[PDB]
């Protein structure tokens with residue numbers, strides 16, 4: 163019988179990814195895994211009908227059950243408001259979910275030996291996480307119409323003396339100026355998420371800053387990461403033969419173009435079908451996995467007109483496998499953990515054996531010289547994955 | 561020989577120092593006589609002169625309008641030890657760009673037999689960002705606890721002050737900063753860009769994120785257009801080239817979908833193929849160099865008597881970009897022809913299958929290159945020298 167998988171929050175989406183999402187469940191997940199599935203429909207029509215309440219409920223569910231897997235969704239704009247006759251221009255579901263969960267987003271390209279890469283030496287991927295700039299963040303920028311002083315001041319709540327910094331004296335002409343800020347707590351959450359990410363994947367962790375220029379702003383990221391590491395993670399890192407190190411952003415871009423890959427890169431600041439995303443909350447317990455791409459509207463329109471499509475499902479499949487692998491980790495569920503690994507290997511192996519969608523065939527041959535016999539359409543490719551998955555799991559039972 | 565005029569030359573360090581002398585000996589000096597202002601920016605000489613030679617080199621470029629620079633060591637702690645330096649001298653490139661100002665444009669040289677990132681790129685993409693000197697700093701500080709951070713603009717006459725709340729720290733501290741740009745720096749950026757797209761005959765695109773920074777980036781967009789509509793749109797349409805603003809997201813898109821051939825002004829294969837040019841606001845002064853370092857790892861092999869294969873292309877194009885600009889300022893037609901002929905010979909040689917190991921590895925993959933697929937540093941220079949002799953001979957008859 164099937165693997166007992168536990169509690170998973172699933173979020174259905176829109177357009178081409180909604181189609182692929184249901185194929186993934188039907189052909190690759192549901193035949194092998196039984197889940198206590200908390201399923202929320204974030205399709206644009208349901209978000210409109212529920213006044214976006216379904217989106218906030220999904221976020222709350224992810225908070226409670228720790229594991230979310232999300233399908234790409236339409237973020238409305240004025241054209242979408244017309245297309246769907248929306249009540250309002252609903253905010254992005256990803257923005258709403260992130261604001262409720264906090265955490266840092268890590269992006270990871272899936273590597274196939276036969277698919278050309280930027281750096282030829284990159285055997286293992288680089289997992290990049292950017293300091294979340296949030297949706298309630300806002301820099302304060304304005305036009306400087308003419309000569310005068312721009313100053314930035316800090317007034318302590320504790321009543322001690324106010325501090326004034328000259329930003330620039332405009333002696334002739336005008337220009338622009340702005341102020342930015344970050345709270346210690348965001349930086350701490352960023353450090354924790356990054357340390358947990360590195361511990362989970364078993365790779366070393368690099369933070370890059372410009373603390374040679376922004377000695378105080380970037381110095382704070384550097385210091386807070388270092389303090390949290392030494393005090394809470396160093397021994398854990400050593401236990402797994404990994405490390406954490408700060409790097410100047412220049413030394414980083416070098417170190418990486420010459421490296422083999424296989425590390426986590428946090429910074430402050432290739433086919434989209436192979437890019438995964440995961441929201442890692444600072445608690446180390448809660449994650450939300452998704453494809454890094456959108457709903458592939460262009461393909462969806464072809465699908466509506468009954469034309470043949472070739473949409474890459476890999477990023478969407480890995481959203482499931484990262485979600486299930488984290489669930490297996492929380493529950494100490496060995497069988498689910500093997501399943502999630504096996505499905506990742508089947509996906510990669512299928513491409514590496516020469517069965518792939520048109521985006522990948524074009525990477526290999528060049529778009530001008532791709533032929534229909536070089537690639538599989540969306541449904542043929544899912545069918546091939548499904549057959550290779552069955553073979554892989556029968557081999558595992560020997 | 562061609563009478564070439566005044567060129568400021570800066571000698572450098574390690575592997576690039578050796579290639580640089582080979583370029584002069586085999587490719588330049590046999591055909592061009594220069595009133596040569598040479599500054600030795602080798603690390604030993606900068607240490608001995610207390611970095612004065614670097615400041616004199618910058619002044620010479622300011623005076624003579626054309627500089628060509630070999631790559632130089634930027635000291636770190638290990639270099640201090642290696643050379644017993646008196647100080648951690650600052651980067652010579654920083655010092656020079658601080659004195660000269662201007663915009664840095666980077667450009668990969670394209671050889672049709674060398675794989676590129678986007679296989680569709682057949683014409684050059686030239687990326688410019690503005691060099692804001694050391695006086696262009698942000699003002700950043702630690703916020704030690706709860707309190708209010710405000711940014712205020714006070715006009716010179718005292719009226720029409722505005723105070724903007726940046727953030728109310730309610731539960732702890734953090735960091736904050738202010739930054740600025742003067743209209744003059746943006747106008748300089750815009751002029752360098754418009755005049756690069758003209759000097760080269762390609763369309764110019766500016767990209768911003770003015771959807772977020774509505775005011776800050778709006779100012780770059782508005783000033784670029786203003787300077788265009790009023791000072792360049794005529795000469796632009798005369799060369800069937802255009803200017804256009806685009807959001808970064810869009811730009812990145814259309815860029816891969818295109819075959820290249822544009823100047824990309826940005827509001828923020830092989831290194832041996834990447835060129836750099838600092839273009840000063842004055843439209844007159846230019847500093848050209850390779851967009852790579854001194855190639856230390858190759859120099860260590862050379863020091864042990866081991867064969868090397870170091871690509872000279874970027875260093876050669878520092879010379880041809882410099883000499884082409886010198887030719888433009890002096891209306892020197894023989895010089896202009898020479899500089900272009902050297903670029904053609906360089907590209908032609910590689911496209912004929914004669915290349916250094918880095919390019920051979922791009923084609924074959926590093927585990928697959930065999931010795932017969934490439935030439936070492938000295939063989940490649942000789943091949944170029946021979947093809948240059950032929951190219952210039954045939955142009956006479």
Ligand SMILES: NC(=O)C1=CN([C@@H]2O[C@H](COP(=O)(O)OP(=O)(O)OC[C@H]3O[C@@H](n4cnc5c(N)ncnc54)[C@H](OP(=O)(O)O)[C@@H]3O)[C@@H](O)[C@H]2O)C=CC1
Pocket residue numbers: 233234235236237238256434435452453454455456457458459460461472473474475477521
């Ligand atoms: N997390 C989310 O929920 C996301 C939401 N979106 C939503 O997605 C919708 C469309 O956004 P769009 O701008 O089209 O960006 P998409 O990423 O959805 O698609 C962009 C293009 O990238 C290529 N591409 C992306 N994913 C794949 C894939 N899996 N297989 C093959 N090719 C792929 C296609 O290029 P080609 O055209 O060359 O085939 C596709 O047209 C919008 O409504 C947007 O709001 C977008 C961002 C993220």
Ligand SMILES: NC(=O)C1=CN([C@@H]2O[C@H](COP(=O)(O)OP(=O)(O)OC[C@H]3O[C@@H](n4cnc5c(N)ncnc54)[C@H](OP(=O)(O)O)[C@@H]3O)[C@@H](O)[C@H]2O)C=CC1
Pocket residue numbers: 416630631632633634635653831832849850851852853854855856857858869870871872918
């Ligand atoms: N403008 C300047 O003066 C510059 C100064 N530097 C200085 O250069 C020194 C070394 O810098 P480094 O970090 O080694 O970076 P480099 O750019 O000097 O060399 C880095 C690597 O890139 C490849 N490479 C670079 N140029 C060539 C070339 N012309 N032909 C073939 N391969 C090339 C080699 O890779 P492989 O090892 O794979 O063969 C080389 O080891 C430092 O002292 C630094 O300060 C660095 C940048 C700019």
